Symmetry: D2
Subunit: 505 residues, 4 copies
């Protein structure tokens, strides 16, 4: 126990890790049924702080066998959980919501430690992610069935909606809490059980969330958390006949593979895949609203969101004023450790993410783009990249065609409204899109014309639990958030009663 | 032109084919855009009458190239069709509904000629199939968006619902009209265009329906009909990025293959696959209701429906009375040509279907089943099979585990309600299920407990356009019929308006 | 001198209507077209010519009671039909109204006076309610609610209320009948409808076509004459479970008060006093075209007409000039004459109210920019008028003119105009013209009115809920919600229920 | 003799309520707890002991006007908060009601008299409306309707009606307050509520907890005293846009009539006369348990209580015997005593009505099977009674007894019982007991009542719409539909709209 003893590795932010551990929120095991568990062979994978390079802890490196045990625990728990009243599940889910909010400051710090975003953004993610738990606790009691007028006098027709069964959920690293709750909350609300595989890059927040679910009275087996061999876990989820639904948020390539694999057992599948959000700034945009909106929509989480602005189309008349004011706004951003106050840009998740950003910037500059701000690795090193604006961008550039997932904003000049809309709609992406215009007719027209699941009109921050989020075309299937998000975890049942009598008098 | 001339092959039912041809409903070409077309190489496939073995006509044997041209015509027509008002599409769809009903007697006779069901059942299928056209003509004007209370004072939140795009539809042979309209009507109502591939066994009814769609004012390219190389057409539909949604009704193996193939372009997929419907006759069932209901639910279309009763669980106390009265009811059925009045059983579609029925009957008899009625090929030969009841059936028999798709009813004795429900729910099928009980509590309990998309409670005939039809588990994805059927052909869009002001005073 | 000496000046049109079976001189009670019990009648006159078209019965309490008994008897069978069965019959009625729209439009012109284009438009609009509720009849959905008690299941059914008594005004002689009768019949109710004694012929033609469509006798009954006596029979009857009324605020308030003693469901649309706000950033052409249509439709005789226009200081002069040019293009005359865009006011009382509003405004400082006097045609034709320099002290600002007079009130700030628009006991329609998305949405949310046209002067549709807030009404007509006025909800709780198995 | 001489016999309970801040002797107007303007008061007595608990103000017109002005002033800010903001505050109120449920239940026992188990149950039930509408506040969804005009877009918004005046009865001193206040506040309305002068203390405790929850001053106001004078101030105020009432049919009809002159939205729940049909194939134990609970809850003082029981000929003798055995197990007394299942009737007028119904039935041939007289405890305790050989000529069959008397009417056919059940002007609750699926669904559909218990005697819930048909009411309370009573629909039509691109 002497301070020189090396059992707990000494390092930066040890005070924060001790406080998280004293709160019961610092886990180094997965959760299967009523036990916190190691992998069967004791293998582990490290979780590192992307801002310092230091070890936080190791988590199990699980695979097929552990995922099968998690699925069996969820299947066993489903019978009782699904037969509880909606009111009973709602009270328990509200207890989980209250615990997430009560522990938001510590949970926010855990997101900073493993993912790197600024603390204000991490605490905001706890409020946002917990909002799905509250929303679906309320919505659990509003799974309404129907009575349909029957065209046959002797028959009566009903529609019931019942939980689908065991859900397999796979989440990415960019929102380590909100991506878990967006999937787990509606599934539990409907009466499903879940086996969730968080990103191996950011698993600690999912484990803290599951510890708080247990404290809330969520029975063992209703929530299970496994990680490690993502391929092996995914195959166990796809091969299981008890897994009736899969939900995935992540890369397009992995999502397409999961969709293809789900076909052999006819699972219900909902996915949110890569986006490439266009943003159209028209001549009649309110300049301050457009600058503030694009700053927020582009550089939130250092550009590492599914809905982030990927390319900005600026109309010829406002181009110079927008480029100047947008550059001034971006120059105010500051990169660093998310646990330092005043920091507004965190590091990119890993070296692969940084290499992609550099590839996009190099390609654009080679094809004629002008670096108006940034355009290089930050002086801090590691995976910090300077917030960048690339003027005179074009449809031949890699950043125009593909998702950069980094703090780079390319500007494309355009002449007519019809030109910008047709260009925005000319891709296989269909997640978020944005438009800035003060005119009622133009605003409504652009919002209707855009072939995207979500449109911000004079708004750069559109994320909410109350509205349906998801993609069109190759950006996804199904929706998350809103009353419709719950339908993904239910099966409709038509009941036809026959030999019915006519009413009397 | 002398009566000895053989240009038109002479045969039975030539008067009916001449009347269909004079009505413009006897087609021997596919439909791509504004042209009725042959296959590019002039290859064809014959359409034969299953009751007589005679040729009706030949249709084109199309493949990849023709399906691509059909997809391009649908894509070109989509821009204008999707931008019409819902009221405009509704008037045109109602004109199509009225033409289907006006021509129902001739259209019913065409279904008899190619598929073989009795004429009363074929005319009933026209009324039922046309009912989807009427339903979605009305529902087109009820695609409601939402205004959601925003938790941000400065934002307003809307949900719009817009057509998905080009739809590829694949239909089976058992309901040659109703399977086309169940898919085409909601797609057109939403504002989609369609490329439909009917079964090569029963394509003439789909072509007659498309001729009437053109007469109704449905523009060229909005409905396209192709047939021939089902594998090649299916691959063209799956490989096309303009096809945004696929809808399939048919075998589980083909449906699983299509689901897997759709993954690579993230298409929206809805399917109705094989069913294996259990029917539970409890001790307190009204005997007459159960006998009449099982007769209708089992032998409609000679057992060749997705929702047909496949296995009957009869409680110990009512077993002898049910078996006796059910045998008497089945002995009244009569097999023959569907154009002869008094005929209530048509032939099985082909020799493969007859071999499967014989395989199921042989397997059951080998494992101890008792032939109470039928159990052999009908004296008419061809693919006519005698309506059959097999007593003392068990869970080890092929007919219990798999879909017979023929006029064979196996009876399984059971002791307790819990035993029957657990047995009914112990399969990967989840389409239709049936139960007969006079008790309120038992009836509601069995209806809630059954893991099937559709439950008939004291009802053997549950089919309707007003209720959602589809499967749970490996029997399907999505629903057809009802307001929910239209959601399969729409994409939700969340629009967030920002920089909004507070109301005044 | 030999030859045909007609009594009226549109005999050819009346003969064509009569050959089509659409010119009636009797009411409808059950399976009979009937006269009043004493044979008394009232004349129906053409407001453009002063000529009698025909006489209709002058019925009262006794006939209304017989109509109520016929509706009550027919209700048992009509309400127990499937929604699909009622829907087919209502669609047959819709198709007949559309098939006969040209003749029916001419009948509206003859008895009410509006231009033929507007009258044919009213047939299309009024028939649209019949189509809408034929479709909606099959979408009366009940609910299954998750029960917090494991042993109970909870359902909501929606069933027809019963016999409906409907009272309609003269300004839309068809659309006011169908917007009440169509949802009532769709739900499974029966109706006893009293059209205005000024325009009863279109209601009777509509009922003849309902009978042709297969609507059974007694499901639709039409009575007219002693409006007070008929109204009292409707309020005193316990079989009348719901009252629907469109018309004056004073009569509506009296009916609401009277309905209380039998706890009837009541829905009404009363007087409106629609403000229209033209902001500085309005598209001038859209505002001029919209205000012209919203104000002068039916010569200003609609409860959604623009009654007062608030014009922002920066656009005032350009708007006043372009709006005067547009109003000067309107043409008054007989509605059967091509090119006519303004018909006569319904009667001398309506004209006297318009003259009272114009002389009050001029006495308090208003400037007559256009019109301001009786038209050269005489009778009840009034020149389309614009009154500049209007104020909140004027009778036209405080009360519903129901005539072709447009007062313009200058304003400075958005907040000033909105607070002024919201400072009355009216709450039916309101209008606003602005190109800005934030201002447009803000004004639409802020307005304390049931209906708001934003860059639109013509908002009427069967697909959206129409009705008033404050003293302008109760309930809504049009849209899915319009059907709920004719339905009673029923919560059914099933007990002693078992838990699902496995 | 030294020692504490209390005025009442439950001083320990009153001291505990007072230490919890839940024992009030003033009304609430804005940010002040107030007396009447002249200092006049009225006593609130314990119905089991006759003892005064405390006095409350005897307010009238002036105080009600001040309460309305406070609600009107608070409405501007409360209605403009986000639904999420109102929801958090309403959930804080729900949590405080539940946290204080044991003390609040005891307060209901003291002023109304029901057993403590029922009073604590009423707190859970009444607080459930607060939770329900806190959740529903965020689900006030508007619509986007497909427009038949290419150049127009159509929206439906739903916005709070304004100041609500709520009048509640004495039989559920908390649940009748919250079922009106919770949806009103959730929608964004403000309220002026007048509890019954017989049971005002629970409403005042509920308002104290609303203030503790962060509900701003003026959003909830509580006044009592001159019920006629307060009611007239509520009806005469133009700022009161909606009235909600639960109570007697005569008072409700008067309020409905009075509301007409300002066209207020009105919802009410009036007297019921619930039939209960026990068919031959009923499960006997379910029927006996259900009828016992449905009839004797609150000693029969609920508007959903079973008022008359129709028993089919084949089950009559078995039902009468088992139902008599179950009724004999009921125990009358002070609600704070364990084992007590029947409390006293509210006052001597309530008792006199029960005695009038029992002597009328006995004079017309009814047989007293159990009870039929004042309880040995005296005061307003009446023995639980069963009257066999009842008929349609008896006062208890025609009118609401609101007491622990169960008349049994023998019947032969299902059609006879249903037609008899439907032959009144009441339409609140009805009950039926049958094991058969076809008969059960048929009776549930046929009954002309707003609520039907099928094999269930206890149907009350916040999740389902509750209210009457015919003369038993207007509007519904509970469920998503209960919130629509506090909202005004607005159709917004956007014009000059463009076609989408590509």
């Amino acid at each position: 126990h002497h301070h020189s003893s090396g059992l707990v590795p000494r390092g930066s932010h040890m005070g924060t890790m001790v406080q998280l551990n004293e709160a019961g929120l610092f886990k180094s095991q997965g959760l299967i049924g009523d036990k916190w568990v190691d992998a069967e062979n004791g293998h582990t994978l490290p979780v590192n702080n992307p801002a310092t390079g230091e070890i936080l802890t190791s988590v199990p490196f699980m695979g097929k066998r552990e995922a099968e045990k998690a699925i069996a625990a969820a299947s066993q728990a489903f019978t009782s959980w699904s037969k509880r009243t909606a009111n009973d599940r709602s009270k328990i889910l509200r207890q989980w919501f209250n615990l997430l909010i009560k522990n938001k400051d510590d949970l926010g710090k855990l997101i900073v430690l493993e993912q790197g975003k600024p603390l204000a953004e991490a605490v905001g993610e706890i409020v946002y992610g917990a909002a799905f738990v509250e929303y679906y606790a309320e919505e659990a009691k509003r799974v309404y069935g129907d009575i349909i007028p029957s065209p046959f006098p002797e028959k009566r027709m009903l529609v019931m909606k019942q939980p689908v069964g065991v859900v397999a959920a796979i989440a990415p690293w960019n929102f380590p809490l909100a991506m878990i709750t967006r999937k787990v909350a509606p599934a539990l609300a409907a009466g499903c059980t879940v086996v969730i595989k968080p990103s191996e890059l950011t698993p600690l927040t999912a484990l803290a969330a599951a510890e708080l679910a247990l404290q809330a009275g969520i029975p063992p087996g209703v929530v299970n958390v496994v990680m490690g061999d993502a391929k092996g876990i995914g195959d166990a989820m796809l091969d299981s006949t008890e897994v009736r639904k899969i939900t995935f948020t992540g890369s397009t390539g992995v999502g397409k593979m999961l969709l293809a694999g789900a076909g052999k057992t006819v699972k219900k599948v909902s996915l949110e895949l890569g986006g490439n959000a266009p943003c159209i700034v028209f001549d009649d945009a309110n300049l301050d609203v457009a600058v503030k909106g694009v700053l927020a929509g582009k550089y939130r989480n250092s550009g590492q969101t599914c809905v982030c602005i990927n390319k900005i189309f600026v109309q010829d008349g406002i181009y110079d004023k927008f480029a100047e004011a947008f550059a001034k706004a971006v120059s105010g951003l500051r990169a660093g450790n998310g646990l330092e106050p005043g920091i507004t840009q965190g590091p990119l998740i890993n070296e692969t993410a940084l290499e992609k950003v550099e590839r996009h910037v190099q390609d654009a500059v080679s094809k004629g783009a002008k670096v108006l701000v940034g355009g290089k690795r930050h002086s801090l090193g590691r995976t910090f990249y300077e917030p960048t604006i690339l003027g005179n961008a074009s449809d031949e550039m890699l950043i125009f065609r593909e998702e950069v997932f980094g703090p780079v904003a390319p500007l494309v000049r355009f002449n007519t409204d019809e030109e910008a809309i047709k260009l925005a709609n000319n891709s296989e992406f269909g997640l978020a899109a944005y438009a800035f215009t003060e005119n009622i007719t133009r605003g409504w027209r652009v919002a209707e014309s855009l072939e995207f699941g979500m449109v911000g009109l004079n708004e750069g921050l559109i994320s909410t639990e109350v509205a349906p989020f998801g993609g069109m075309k190759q950006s996804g299937l199904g929706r998350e958030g809103s009353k419709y998000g719950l339908d993904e975890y239910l099966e409709m049942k038509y009941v036809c009663l026959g030999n019915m009598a006519q009413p009397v008098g």
